[PDB]
Design a protein around this ligand. Sequence first.
Ligand SMILES: [Cl-]
Ligand SMILES: [Cl-]
Length: 162
Amino acid sequence: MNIFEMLRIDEGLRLKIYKDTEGYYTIGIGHLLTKSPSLNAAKSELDKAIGRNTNGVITKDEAEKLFNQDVDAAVRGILRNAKLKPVYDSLDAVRRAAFINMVFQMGETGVAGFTNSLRMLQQKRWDEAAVNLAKSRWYNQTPNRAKRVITTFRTGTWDAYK
Ligand SMILES: [Cl-]
Ligand SMILES: [Cl-]
């Protein structure tokens, strides 16, 4: 198991514009297109992202291409972030995958907001951090995915995904 396979299980794959759990226009493997309500605004962003007139539909290769960019951007954002970097640096390889997953789903700003849990992860207080991560809107909104991520943090293994 690796970050790519982990996120592909959590996000799924869709080749037609769809609405995410929050109601926003998304395509492929969790690629947010726009927070705007306009499907047109969404198709426009889509075409811009792909470099062609897509009429709202893309191929597998195109979806994967967006996915590769997004994982890269996620990693590079963590490493550029003063609040996140030290956390990431302190973690083992499995837990680093779990942190990237959060960042991909909620943005750098969002994760940077989990101040208390970050301090706990850095100190390697796994159980306590797992309890604190659960007290969040994130966990209440997408409980199955949150539990998987949290278990990865608590255990340091890929069990939740196996
Ligand atoms: Cl893009
Ligand atoms: Cl869920």
